[PDB]
């Protein structure tokens, strides 16, 4: 059917690494699934699609920003103006991508979850994309984005603490991204370290609960948790 055709097209777009089209296909899948919930597979295809589309503009934004600061530190103000105009184009694309996924998540998927599985997943994703907004927005828009991020992550954390094993890859990913939020967005290294440490310990504490299928996913995140701590614990030094 509609749904199945566009799911397959989305998988093809992924293979071809034509991710803007993958988002289009998954947006058509999600729209075709109105009352029903997305499958685990469709949820993951949607997430991969948006992660890659935003990831590419995020990379470009960081690079153009480094160049902007260097050329600004230099007396070529003429170069700096051009770089700022270009970064503005990138920020426009970033804003439009976040608006697309936040509306789709906010209008269909979050209301439709009622699974706690998917509740935490979609809440984490809402927080993620508000955070990607907070990465480049300024003034009140940055404030609003960061506040919505914190609120999304908190709601996610409540459902996850109450209904997901400490070794659950969704709960672990949420902890990871929430800690990153504190370190990078809120500039609270103490808070970020505390949260990452807690999520790791609570997962090795109850490390029996982990699933064979769940293991590659969880262990990956837990290593990232340690890796973050490894840098933070060293920037509590540097």
């Amino acid at each position: 059917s509609g749904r199945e055709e566009f799911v397959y097209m989305a998988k093809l777009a992924e293979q071809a690494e034509r991710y803007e089209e993958m988002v289009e296909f998954m947006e058509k899948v999600s729209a075709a699934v109105d009352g029903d919930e997305l499958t685990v597979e469709e949820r993951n295809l949607l997430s991969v699609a948006y992660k890659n589309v935003i990831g590419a503009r995020r990379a470009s934004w960081r690079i153009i920003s480094s160049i902007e600061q260097k050329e600004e530190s230099r007396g070529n103000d003429d170069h700096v103006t051009a770089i700022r105009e270009y970064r503005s184009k990138i920020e426009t694309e970033l804003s439009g991508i976040c608006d697309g996924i936040l509306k789709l998540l906010d209008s269909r998927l979050i209301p439709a979850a009622a699974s706690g599985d998917s509740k935490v997943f979609y809440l984490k994703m809402k927080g993620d994309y508000h955070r990607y907004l907070a990465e480049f927005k300024t003034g009140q828009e940055r404030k609003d984005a960061a506040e919505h991020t914190l609120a999304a992550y908190k709601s996610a954390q409540d459902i996850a603490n109450a209904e997901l094993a400490p070794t659950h890859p969704i709960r672990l990913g949420l902890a990871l991204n929430f800690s990153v939020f504190y370190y990078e967005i809120l500039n609270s290294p103490d808070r970020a370290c505390n949260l990452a440490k807690q999520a790791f310990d609570e997962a090795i504490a109850e490390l029996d609960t982990l699933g064979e299928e769940s293991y590659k996913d969880s262990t990956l995140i837990m290593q990232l948790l340690r890796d973050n701590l490894t840098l933070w614990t060293s920037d509590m030094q540097d």
């Binding site: 984490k124 993620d128 672990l172 990913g173 949420l174 990871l176 991204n177 990153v180 370190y183 990078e184 990956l220 995140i221 990232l224 890796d227 973050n228 840098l231 933070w232």
Partner: peptide, 5 residues
């Protein structure tokens, strides 16, 4: 810092 895949 790194985030979830």
């Amino acid at each position: 810092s790194n985030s979830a895949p």
